[PDB]
UniProtKB/Swiss-Prot annotation, chain A:
Residue ranges occupied by any S4 RNA-binding domain in the UniProt entry: 107-180
Protein name listed in UniProt: Small ribosomal subunit protein uS4
Chain residue ranges for the region called Disordered: 161-180
Gene Ontology molecular function terms on file: RNA binding; rRNA binding; structural constituent of ribosome; translation regulator activity
UniProtKB/Swiss-Prot annotation, chain B:
Organism of provenance: Homo sapiens (Human)
Associated clinical condition: Diamond-Blackfan anemia 3: A form of Diamond-Blackfan anemia, a congenital non-regenerative hypoplastic anemia that usually presents early in infancy. Diamond-Blackfan anemia is characterized by a moderate to severe macrocytic anemia, erythroblastopenia, and an increased risk of developing leukemia. 30 to 40% of Diamond-Blackfan anemia patients present with short stature and congenital anomalies, the most frequent being craniofacial (Pierre-Robin syndrome and cleft palate), thumb and urogenital anomalies.
Database matches in InterPro entries: eRP_eS24_sf, Ribosomal_eS24, Ribosomal_eS24_CS, Ribosomal_uL23/eL15/eS24_sf
Described function: Component of the small ribosomal subunit. The ribosome is a large ribonucleoprotein complex responsible for the synthesis of proteins in the cell. Required for processing of pre-rRNA and maturation of 40S ribosomal subunits. Part of the small subunit (SSU) processome, first precursor of the small eukaryotic ribosomal subunit.
GO cellular component: cytoplasm; cytosol; cytosolic ribosome; cytosolic small ribosomal subunit; endoplasmic reticulum; membrane; nucleolus; nucleoplasm
Cross-link (Glycyl lysine isopeptide (Lys-Gly) (interchain with G-Cter in SUMO2)): 35
Name of this protein: Small ribosomal subunit protein eS24
Localization annotation: Cytoplasm; Nucleus, Nucleolus
Family indicated by similarity: Belongs to the eukaryotic ribosomal protein eS24 family.
Curated annotation (Swiss-Prot), chain C:
Family, similarity comment: Belongs to the TRAFAC class translation factor GTPase superfamily. Bms1-like GTPase family. TSR1 subfamily.
Cell location: Nucleus, Nucleolus
Role noted for this protein: Required during maturation of the 40S ribosomal subunit in the nucleolus.
Protein's UniProt name: Pre-rRNA-processing protein TSR1 homolog
Top-level taxon in the UniProt lineage: Eukaryota
Swiss-Prot record, chain D:
The name this protein goes by in its record: Small ribosomal subunit protein eS4, X isoform
SMART domains: S4
PANTHER family: 30S/40S RIBOSOMAL PROTEIN S4, SMALL RIBOSOMAL SUBUNIT PROTEIN ES4
Keywords: Acetylation, Cytoplasm, Isopeptide bond, Nucleus, Ribonucleoprotein, Ribosomal protein, RNA-binding, rRNA-binding, Ubl conjugation
Role summary: Component of the small ribosomal subunit. The ribosome is a large ribonucleoprotein complex responsible for the synthesis of proteins in the cell. Part of the small subunit (SSU) processome, first precursor of the small eukaryotic ribosomal subunit. During the assembly of the SSU processome in the nucleolus, many ribosome biogenesis factors, an RNA chaperone and ribosomal proteins associate with the nascent pre-rRNA and work in concert to generate RNA folding, modifications, rearrangements and cleavage as well as targeted degradation of pre-ribosomal RNA by the RNA exosome.
Quaternary organization: Component of the small ribosomal subunit. Part of the small subunit (SSU) processome, composed of more than 70 proteins and the RNA chaperone small nucleolar RNA (snoRNA) U3. Identified in a IGF2BP1-dependent mRNP granule complex containing untranslated mRNAs.
GO biological processes: cytoplasmic translation; positive regulation of cell population proliferation; positive regulation of translation; ribosomal small subunit biogenesis; translation
Length: 180, 124, 73, 262
RNA sequence: CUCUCGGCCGAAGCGUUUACUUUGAAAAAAUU
RNA sequence: UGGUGACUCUAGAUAACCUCGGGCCGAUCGCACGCCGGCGGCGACGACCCAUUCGAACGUCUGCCCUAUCAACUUUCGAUGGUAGUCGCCGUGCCUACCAUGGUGACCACGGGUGACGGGGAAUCAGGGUUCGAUUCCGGAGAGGGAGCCUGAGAAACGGCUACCACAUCCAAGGAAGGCAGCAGGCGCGCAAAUUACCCACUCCCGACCCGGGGAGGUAGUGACGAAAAAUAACAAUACAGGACUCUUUCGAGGCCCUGUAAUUGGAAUGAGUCCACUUUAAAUCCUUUAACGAGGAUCCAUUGGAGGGCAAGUCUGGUGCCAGCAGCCGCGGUAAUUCCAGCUCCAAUAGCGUAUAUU
RNA sequence: UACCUGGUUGAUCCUGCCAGUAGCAUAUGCUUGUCUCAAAGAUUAAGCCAUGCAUGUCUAAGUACGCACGGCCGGUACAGUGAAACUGCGAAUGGCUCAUUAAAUCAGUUAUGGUUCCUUUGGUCGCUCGUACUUGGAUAACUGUGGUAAUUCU
């Protein structure tokens, strides 16, 4: 006996067919649109969406006045509204099945840094996040797969310690300015 | 100068004659500050001498802002000596640990288990 | 293994004393010997030849006199 | 095993203690005492995990051995002492008096009590027997055997006793239309009025209890504790009055508190 | 569904017994 | 008297008994000391018997894989039941004596097998299912194999004893001492699995005990079992190249973006590492925080498989010539080989990717 | 994600298997920059083990005549700390493994009105009509003499 926890999951599933041209083209189009590292990020978002839809489809089998269905349905709806994937008007359990992978990929920190004009490219956005130039509210966030909440989007800043933020220019400018 | 000390959940534990609290240290430019500076700032904060304040468990958050630790101010040094663990007293020089390892005294215990009577104190 | 302390040296001798031995077939089929002490008595010093007395432990097969002896060099 | 067990694992400990999963391998194994270990708080969990007066078990030992903690008016130095239902814990150094009363969700709520309430306690009598030259004895739920009781007190009744003398002050009869609380099963910690009791000879008799909001439920006699005469309780109640809220009402109250306090 | 004892009701038998179905209370934590 | 659903219950009364291998009925310690020569306040160790707590142990009902090339089994030596006893903590063929001939079975007894400890659970899965579960939680069993004990509340205990069986250590040859399916470690076995490290600080446990002890447990070392996050570069200007908006019959003319080839340039941002210090901790290490150094492609250079079809991506070039070989399958190779061996190029996944095997 | 593809023929449609496909666990090969968790001598040999460690324990409160002590004040019965030893408790928990085991174990459900129970907690302890202002013999530790090659022997 040890005081250790062994709970862990896999966050993706490998597809059934290895070489299908339509799936390869669609996944590469997603990677190019959102500047992702490999197919595993696409598969991870796809697996998250599949879990959400399985939960909703399990909820829709119950009676409309069931207590579990109401409680879990409003929980799932509020969770999907808070990340900005659902809207307030279309906050119903039937609309959850109409969700896309591209809906969830817009909510990444990479996409939101690119959209707000902090970066000039989606690849530049991934670099800038990985380089510790981006902060959210006050915490420096180094993860590009950071899902931005709807109340957390309005203030994404340049992390004052960064050269693009407050000050202290980096290694290259200090070396080049110390030439003469 | 820019180092700021703030206190979360505070309690006067009269059962152990102390005041226990959670400390946040804000140091936006520097590294994680040493314990002596934190002890001095709690000493000026709570009007008590820094020789009785014991602080520990300081974790610096990612990014480089806050540091969160735990702190205790005792009423006197006698209560501090009676109620602190010996290792937090040894960080202030109030304790001295024996220099013998485990294995030496385990083997010594077995060796004197092999012998009987006042001859037990001779072996070593 | 480390060789820094005499305790590590005793551990290393314990390791070498208890190994699975790798056996070479060429050694095991011939009868070889490592010379621990070599003495020489010349038959004639002008001839520069004589009887050699090489002493050591027999390690391979049973050492029979009638077979020829090869000195490797 | 070859004899009685002395250890206890955290994951095999009772869930109402609310122990972690990575602090250790071992839970506090309670000592034998007036309460079952499945139905008790050891003093280390109360002093360390609930009240936060101590940070480690060494500090619990250091507080208990300085003779500050009383259980039913008796100084206890065993840190794993089994403290149970209706139980009075007095800390005279800080001037605090707590009762261990079950919470609505099935846990032991720390209920601070006014110091003149800390002089008495309620006990559910477990058995009646006549022994040793015609002397009757009660045995209660916390193993206090009381000789020479009132002859009207029967089994499943409750008694209010003074802690300094250990003698009965006054009792409540088990009957319908009385206030009770649940100490076991799924409905643990709920307070309501006895509606009826159905008899099943050779088996468990079942009691139906109606809540103050009209919610009906059932338990066994082994899980009923009469706390009031009629509707008024003989003790102070926790912050929740023993009314179980569904998860929807708990969510609504949480969102209301979030809206009110920002 | 009812005749007797007690305050329109509570006790007593039920009703040939089941299978079925719904409900209630018991079904350790961890894991799901 | 009191109680149960039901006592041969509890309590009461009477007549006696009460074991020398004997039943309780205080020849014990501490702290303060104080009041009418004598009385005393707290506490610790005690104690037959009740109850309580932790249990334990015997029972009730239902539930398990394969096998009939196992169809009848059980009872002389208890098999099924009765009566009286013995033994046992107690109920009982648990054992004895005397009796009766019963008991289980195609609704699969009995026998054999299991690469069978059982559950909580795990993998896979539309729904139904299949397979796994030695493995940290609960229960059982056992300490080389059997057997018998002492002590004790509790063991048929093995880091207790006594034997026999099998191994095996020191001998001065008479004797003596053993038990890692605990923690490390070693040999052997194998396709197959880590350090003879540090600490009782955390979690708890034991003791006469706030103090001592714990290879329990914790902390490091080894660790591509497996799971989570996530680098290997981004941008700007030019030279070509596309696709759009405006003006033009059209050609064309532009200020609108995009793309790589850049055998073209340019400074900026960095983490890897190097390494003060603080923080972490029982002491450390790691992570985090931070001074200083650390980036132009000959580097701080990403692999593993494949390119006829299934199945994504070459009828390229050279060599070989039914050879060497490739090829899960269909097949390729016998002189233009899209399949071998290489070079170039391309394709898939990517810090991972092959192959063998069990399984879904 | 309730899915299929190649191969029997001159060609076709079937039955039918083989092969392909994806996951999961062991092993092994090539490769490996950062960070968080994390299984790990189960399978075969419940095979065999060098060495070291894994269970000990004192409060004001059972027994202190070891100068082992700085040390009282001195006829102070016992100032205090206290090795050793006697006494008491624990060593029946924990840890390891999965050989045995097929209504057995185990799981859920119930019974002990058929039994025992250290300890904890509460009850009870002039309820007996029959030297005490204190009873007796030892035995460790200590001193001294030894035995055996050898032991936690005596």
């Amino acid at each position: 006996p040890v005081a250790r926890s062994w709970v862990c999951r896999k966050t993706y599933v490998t597809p059934r067919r290895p070489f299908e041209k339509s799936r390869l083209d669609q996944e590469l189009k997603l990677i190019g649109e959102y500047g992702l590292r490999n197919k595993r990020e696409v598969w991870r978002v796809k697996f998250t969406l599949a879990k959400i839809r399985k939960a909703a489809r399990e909820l829709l089998t119950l009676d409309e006045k069931d207590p579990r269905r109401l409680f879990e349905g409003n929980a799932l709806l509020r969770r999907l509204v808070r990340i900005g994937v659902l809207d307030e008007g279309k906050m119903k359990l039937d609309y959850i099945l109409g969700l896309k992978i591209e809906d969830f990929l817009e909510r990444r920190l990479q996409t939101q840094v690119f959209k707000l004009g902090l970066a000039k490219s989606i690849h530049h956005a991934r670099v800038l996040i990985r380089q510790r130039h981006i902060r959210v509210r006050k915490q420096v966030v180094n993860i590009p797969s950071f899902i931005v909440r709807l109340d957390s989007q309005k203030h994404i800043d340049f992390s004052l310690r960064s050269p693009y933020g407050g000050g202290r220019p980096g290694r290259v400018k200090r070396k080049n300015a110390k030439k003469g | 100068d820019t180092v700021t000390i703030r206190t979360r959940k505070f309690m006067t534990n009269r059962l152990l004659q102390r005041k226990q609290m959670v400390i946040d240290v804000l140091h936006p430019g520097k590294a994680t500050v040493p314990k002596t500076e934190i002890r001095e700032k709690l000493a000026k904060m709570y009007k008590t001498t820094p020789d009785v304040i014991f602080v520990f468990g300081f974790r610096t958050h990612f990014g480089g802002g806050k540091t969160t630790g735990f702190g205790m101010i005792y009423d006197s040094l006698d209560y501090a000596k009676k109620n602190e663990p010996k290792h937090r007293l040894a960080r202030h020089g109030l304790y001295e640990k024996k220099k013998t390892s485990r294995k030496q005294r385990k083997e010594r215990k077995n060796r004197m288990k092999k012998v009987r009577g006042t001859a037990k104190a001779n072996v070593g | 293994l480390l060789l820094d302390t005499q305790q590590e040296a005793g551990m290393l001798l314990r390791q070498l004393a208890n190994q699975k031995q790798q056996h070479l077939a060429f050694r095991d089929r011939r009868a070889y010997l490592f010379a621990h002490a070599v003495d020489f008595v010349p038959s004639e010093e002008n001839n520069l030849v004589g009887t050699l007395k090489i002493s050591g432990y027999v390690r391979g097969q049973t050492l029979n006199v009638n077979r020829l002896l090869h000195i490797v060099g | 095993a070859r004899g009685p067990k002395k250890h206890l694992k955290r994951v095999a400990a009772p869930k109402h203690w609310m122990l972690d999963k990575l602090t250790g391998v071992f839970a506090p194994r309670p000592s034998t005492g007036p309460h079952k270990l499945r139905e008790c708080l050891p003093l280390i969990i109360f002093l360390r995990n609930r009240l936060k007066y101590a940070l480690t078990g060494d500090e619990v030992k250091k507080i208990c051995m300085q003779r500050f903690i009383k259980i039913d008016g008796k100084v206890r130095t065993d840190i794993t002492y089994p403290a149970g239902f209706m139980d009075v814990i007095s800390i005279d150094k800080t001037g605090e008096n707590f009762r261990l009363i079950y919470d609505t969700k099935g846990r032991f709520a720390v209920h601070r009590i006014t110091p003149e309430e800390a002089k008495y306690k309620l006990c559910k009598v477990r058995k009646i027997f006549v022994g040793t030259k015609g002397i009757p004895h009660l045995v209660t739920h916390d193993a206090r055997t009381i000789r020479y009781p009132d002859p009207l007190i029967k089994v499943n009744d409750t008694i209010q006793i003074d802690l300094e003398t250990g003698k009965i002050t006054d009792f409540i009869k088990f009957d319908t239309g009385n206030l009770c609380m649940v100490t076991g099963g799924a409905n643990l910690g709920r307070i309501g009025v006895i509606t009826n009791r159905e008899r099943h000879p050779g088996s468990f008799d079942v009691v139906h209890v109606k809540d103050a909001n009209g919610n009906s439920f059932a338990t066994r006699l082994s899980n009923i504790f009469v706390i009031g005469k009629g509707n008024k309780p003989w003790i102070s109640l926790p912050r929740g009055k023993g009314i179980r809220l569904t998860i929807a009402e708990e969510r609504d109250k949480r969102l209301a508190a979030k809206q009110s306090s920002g």
